[PDB]
Amino acid sequence: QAITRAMADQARTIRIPVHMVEVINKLGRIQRELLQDLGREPTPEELAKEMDITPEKVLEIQQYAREPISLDQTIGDEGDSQLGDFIEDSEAVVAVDAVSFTLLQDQLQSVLDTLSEREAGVVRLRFGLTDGQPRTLDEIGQVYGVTRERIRQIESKTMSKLRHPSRSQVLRDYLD
Amino acid sequence: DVNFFDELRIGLATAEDIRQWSYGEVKKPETINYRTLKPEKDGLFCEKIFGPTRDWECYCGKYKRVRFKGIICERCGVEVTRAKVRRERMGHIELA
Amino acid sequence: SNNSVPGAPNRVSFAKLREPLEVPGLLDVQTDSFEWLIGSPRWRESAAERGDVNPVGGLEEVLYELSPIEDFSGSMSLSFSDPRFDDVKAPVDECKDKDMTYAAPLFVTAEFINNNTGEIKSQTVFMGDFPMMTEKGTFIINGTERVVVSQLVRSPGVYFDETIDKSTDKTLHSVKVIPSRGAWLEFDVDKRDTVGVRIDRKRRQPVTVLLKALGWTSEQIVERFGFSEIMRSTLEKDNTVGTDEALLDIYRKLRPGEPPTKESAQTLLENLFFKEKRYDLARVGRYKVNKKLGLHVGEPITSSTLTEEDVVATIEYLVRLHEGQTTMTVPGGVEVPVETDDIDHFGNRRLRTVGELIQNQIRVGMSRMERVVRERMTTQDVEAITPQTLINIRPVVAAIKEFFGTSQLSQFMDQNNPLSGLTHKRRLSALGPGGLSRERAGLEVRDVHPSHYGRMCPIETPEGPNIGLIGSLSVYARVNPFGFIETPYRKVVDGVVSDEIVYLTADEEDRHVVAQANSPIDADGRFVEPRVLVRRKAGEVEYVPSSEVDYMDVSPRQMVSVATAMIPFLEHDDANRALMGANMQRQAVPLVRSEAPLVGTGMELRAAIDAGDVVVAEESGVIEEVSADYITVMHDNGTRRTYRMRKFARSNHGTCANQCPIVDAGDRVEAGQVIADGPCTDDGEMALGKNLLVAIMPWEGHNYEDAIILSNRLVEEDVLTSIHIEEHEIDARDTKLGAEEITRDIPNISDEVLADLDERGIVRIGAEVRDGDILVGKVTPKGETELTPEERLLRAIFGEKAREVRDTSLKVPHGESGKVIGIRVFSREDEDELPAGVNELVRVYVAQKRKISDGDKLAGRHGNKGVIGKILPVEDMPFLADGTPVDIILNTHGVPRRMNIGQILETHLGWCAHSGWKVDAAKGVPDWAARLPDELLEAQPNAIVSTPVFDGAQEAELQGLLSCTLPNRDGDVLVDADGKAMLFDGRSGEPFPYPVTVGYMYIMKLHHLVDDKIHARSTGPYSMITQQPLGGKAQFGGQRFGEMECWAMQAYGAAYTLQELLTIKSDDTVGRVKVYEAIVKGENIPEPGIPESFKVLLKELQSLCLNVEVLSSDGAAIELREGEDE
Amino acid sequence: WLSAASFQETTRVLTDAAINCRSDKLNGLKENVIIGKLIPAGTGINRYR
Amino acid sequence: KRLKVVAAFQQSGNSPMGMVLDAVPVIPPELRPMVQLDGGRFATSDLNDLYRRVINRNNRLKRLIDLGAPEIIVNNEKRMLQESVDALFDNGRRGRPVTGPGNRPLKSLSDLLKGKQGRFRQNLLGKRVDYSGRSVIVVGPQLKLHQCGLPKLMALELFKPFVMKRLVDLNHAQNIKSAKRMVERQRPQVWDVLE
DNA sequence: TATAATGGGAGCTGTCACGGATG
DNA sequence: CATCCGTGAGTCCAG
């Protein structure tokens, strides 16, 4: 009891709960039972009906049973070629795409200018340029020294003013 | 981050040096979860110990914005900095 | 004619009449073996005709070694018999298509015997799906054609070595007993005249210690080994005496740490060397030891184990060979030659084919399930035990699956051209499990041994670090049922050559005396001269009277392999260039249409047919209907067979396997005839290249250092043009954010880019594709992360809401291009069985019609390689008198250094073959053309000829044939008797000052084309750990600037260049990004930072309990973009 | 100990260097290339730099 | 010989106690990465199974001590723990190596530094570089000594961010993002730009 | 998780040249 | 001067 429990709990490099192991073992059991019965490895549709009657899960189970492989392991022909040397760091930052973002900042800096100080005010407020957060509009008008929510009034006084650098298409390029 | 430093010294590491390095003791052999595919707590990839998987994204998800910087969420104790830290943050194991 | 057997085009042969025996089934090395494994009908008959008494199949053997399986009680007994297959689960073509393994299910009959209850339950058990071999001698594992290479191993047995002492300078004799599997045992002789033994590499002890341990009296030691003073000196210096004291002594030295009982030392000495469980000489292991000692030589092979008689007879062999004795009779055994054994002799060097390699892996899987069987017996109750409960076949199916998937002997099939595959099947490797490592191999293993004659080629071997370790099997050789390499020899009774032929193994040939194949023979069969050329043991040669001639070689071309024999005038090229020339024919590429060479050696016919990449008729008949799609043949008996043509199929190596029908409708065709041929084949012949008009001269430096110059005719007429197909794949999986879906709708893409797709999202058949374009439009749901506050703003202005689907489409890789010649869609929806998690899987097959270009590698058969330097306009070409431009200009300088003047002789014979000739019969038949067979005294224009290796044309005849060259259509001779011709420089107009050697030569287009070899990268993907650029053209990687490459920088003193390459160009995480910016902004390059890979190091030292600190000038530990905390 | 470790017997070098507390003055070719500094030779010397 | 060791611990206030460990450092996860491949299967470093090996036996030691097991069982675990930490720092050093699947010996910590493929001679003394390429060479008698024929296709990728620059200069492309798309699509303009 | 059950199992085979610790 | 264990044994490419 202690072995089989400690076996199911420790052997997996990625830990699966006890019942999940009970399942896969039942699956391998019913497989070997249907193995000698059909002279062929049984279809997923066949295996499913006998034990859990659900085909989608059996597929899912058979992937759980799949044991991972080592990065440090190599290819047989030459002892220099290890697997990890082929794994592309998907995390790492693309040079051009990050630089292009930087050039997008220089275009919005040429937008904070044509816009007024009131106009370039609510812009960096609800969008959160210097902040990093999008504050609720009923808090933005009250945190700012102009009232009668005239800051929402200035909003529409900008939406069309932004159409001109949009009609200059200098912002149109950076969306595609 | 100036490039010019004069000397590179090597020594025999104290057991106390080991604990001064580490941001926490690994107590579980578990790597990740089998469903969530997330670093399980107090494990080999625990985000409380080594850091966040995604930039400024806290483990429990209570903090998911760049606005919180250097904030230690109370529900899972994960500092919010880049996943760039998981290449520099150490751990340790306390042998009995 | 040469091979007037199948119905082949006439290729006339300069020759001495070769009628010993036709080239054996070249694929029989693979075929015959697998037939023994499964025990096919054709094998049992083949065992009968060979007169093999009581044949046992490869699978039959494993079951008998196994059967029966009993527990310690003897209560239970499980046993297997009668293995049988069903029909194959799916046809070969379907397996290649659906990526499933070509196999037929194996069944066995198993019964559970019980001695207590006396009852027996017997039933049939399923053993799994068994990988079957094709007709072409290949396996198909998961839809990729594979090949099992034969392994050259060290045969089991007892070997004797003579080593010379450094100090005493006396001859010391050592023995080593090698089991198929088990413990070690080596008797050696000191300089102290005292015999010693090392068991499994334990310390040395006196050998008498072992004799008194066996039970032999101290008096019998004096009797048997008394004739020497070195054994009397051994029994005298003997430490202790007594049967008990010896066993204890041996035990104490074998396994220290364990309590020595008189009953525990007697036992393991029995088990380590005399039990089938721990120790085992194979059938060869028994047979080889016996021959060496000459006992039970007549008695059939029943013993699989070592005996005491073997031990004693071995030591007797050691002592006699030490004191100078030359021969010895073992008491109860026939007389045996006594000497030291060469481990590299092909009588001691063994060849294990496909059958044994699979059998061994089968044996591994059986002993595993046997462990489970013996566990499942003690568990369950006796009454409810069936074989179905005891048997777990899961380890068996995993042992055979793993082998074909992992082992260094299940190889991707070399599928450049039909020859490339053929040579892959006949390879002999020393590498692989059970064999030796590449470092472990010294220089003796690799060089050419005398016993290689007729068995393994001495020319065909890799140039690289693998040299000598891999070879090709010879043409006429075959493998005997014991894993050794036989070879055919003609039998000479008494100076008279008989057509009776016997195959001899290596050591069997050593006891005999063989005559070279070209020794002159009477029309009856008697020798001409008394003293003839004779081959003898130890590669030694001497003249010997014809009374003593035992056998003679079958053919002059007996020593060579299949690829080697296809090199005209081989005997004129030094081994080095000849070597490459054999390794390079394998590298040729199939061209749009192929021509048979003007010059051949006769090996071009049988090679193409045996390759199995042409279409051969099974039964005679008449072509009832022919299409480009298929040929239908009407047999004489009334039945109809139809052969489907392979059309534009992608090989393993991207070359184009395309079969075209040869026969026209209504043609009468006989059985075994080539009715349709494939890639690199012209009328059922190996056509690896094209016949080109050569010109041997330096031309304006463009051909300097082995470069080549081409005529544009070869590009305008597709003479050197090939088709290359690629296979692009992509699938739609289930993700955590939903599931990937293949659609025509891709985010932020015009209808101009999507124009070449259909409504599905797939490219349309016949459309053309360039790199970067879209093949299969697939989108995936992207993680709902807070989008950029700077892009949120950008989406409010233009009012365009963001989609949650990111582009994950299959675009064409850099460098690829061509036409889309077919789509293969698999849907989980349409019940197509996919792996768990996949929905739609698409394959797109793009073909490129590549013309030849600069940088492409051309090569002749004589190791004369070289890349295309310049393709001149057709008019620039140095041309002959009649205005015909030459095709290829080879540099003169690169001929007399390489010793391959065979390329020249081919050119001479190449012109003769193209122009034709006619010997002068007036005033009789000339004295030079006196050995010339009648058929060659007159030749047509564009005639094909044979020049068999170590035979064929002689330099006398060739000089003469240059004189006979027929004039062109304008009634003018073009070349002289020197083989040269006057040329006009196509550029200046003036004729060249000196006659230039001109003629035809067979050039091959190797698979080293620039389109594949060219590569470059600005920025791209980076390594995960080291953060350095990835590696390989396939990964869009950068070049490596190695340790050697840095030394060159340092020597120069270019510190900044060097620094840049190792910093901002490589793994400076922040640096590379900022260098990109400074370049596109036209600014200055920034000062490099800290290599992220150096940062990695300090974390790797730290993790090893090495307190490493970086200190500033003051003495304080500084931070490396990181901090410390507890 | 950096130049030595990148040469041969890397494990032997480090065990010794750790014990002897050997401080490395990064003033050499081998030493400098590893850390990414300008090599103390050619254009890298302060005379020209 | 003995002094050469003992005098070294004398001089620097570098205690010999360090040769015995009470706590073992754990290397950062991204340096012992665990990655999911396109085949669904996961790929992990060898270190993760060696670290896993230590903690499993180290924690089993904790349970055994706490239960008050006999010394025979407790001592066994300690030996196991010893070999575990050993095989982590240097595998194969003492006794037979720790095998994973395929009887393959696992890479240890020190195995990351040793010899050719090690972190020193493979990743520091020689690196891979950006802005670089490779191709077949061919004689060019037409060239002067200081010249070379660099393939048009090659140069465009080498000088890619150099050309994007001049594309947005001469107004062929409105921005840097489009300029990339003109080079990738290999529009006829760029060949005039590259020269 | 109550019939009784009590000490493992594959080795791995063809190097080579050298210094340092031991003889 | 001779044994036993540990450490060396060309580079780049593809794969």
Ligand SMILES: CO[C@H]1/C=C/O[C@@]2(C)Oc3c(C)c(O)c4c(O)c(c(/C=N/N5CCN(C)CC5)c(O)c4c3C2=O)NC(=O)/C(C)=C\C=C\[C@H](C)[C@H](O)[C@@H](C)[C@@H](O)[C@@H](C)[C@H](OC(C)=O)[C@@H]1C
């Ligand atoms: C699974 O087997 C692998 C090795 C195991 O390991 C190992 C130790 O045992 C090997 C055996 C038993 C071999 O018989 C062999 C071999 O015959 C060979 C090369 C040549 N190796 N070079 C290759 C790279 N290169 C720049 C340097 C050296 C090998 O390395 C090996 C080889 C080994 O290396 N070649 C030749 O003899 C001749 C002269 C030309 C080659 C023909 C083509 C090209 C190949 O056959 C292609 C079609 C593939 O089939 C192989 C590539 C296999 O790859 C796969 C996955 O299928 C590979 C043999």
Ligand SMILES: [Zn+2]
């Ligand atoms: Zn949280």
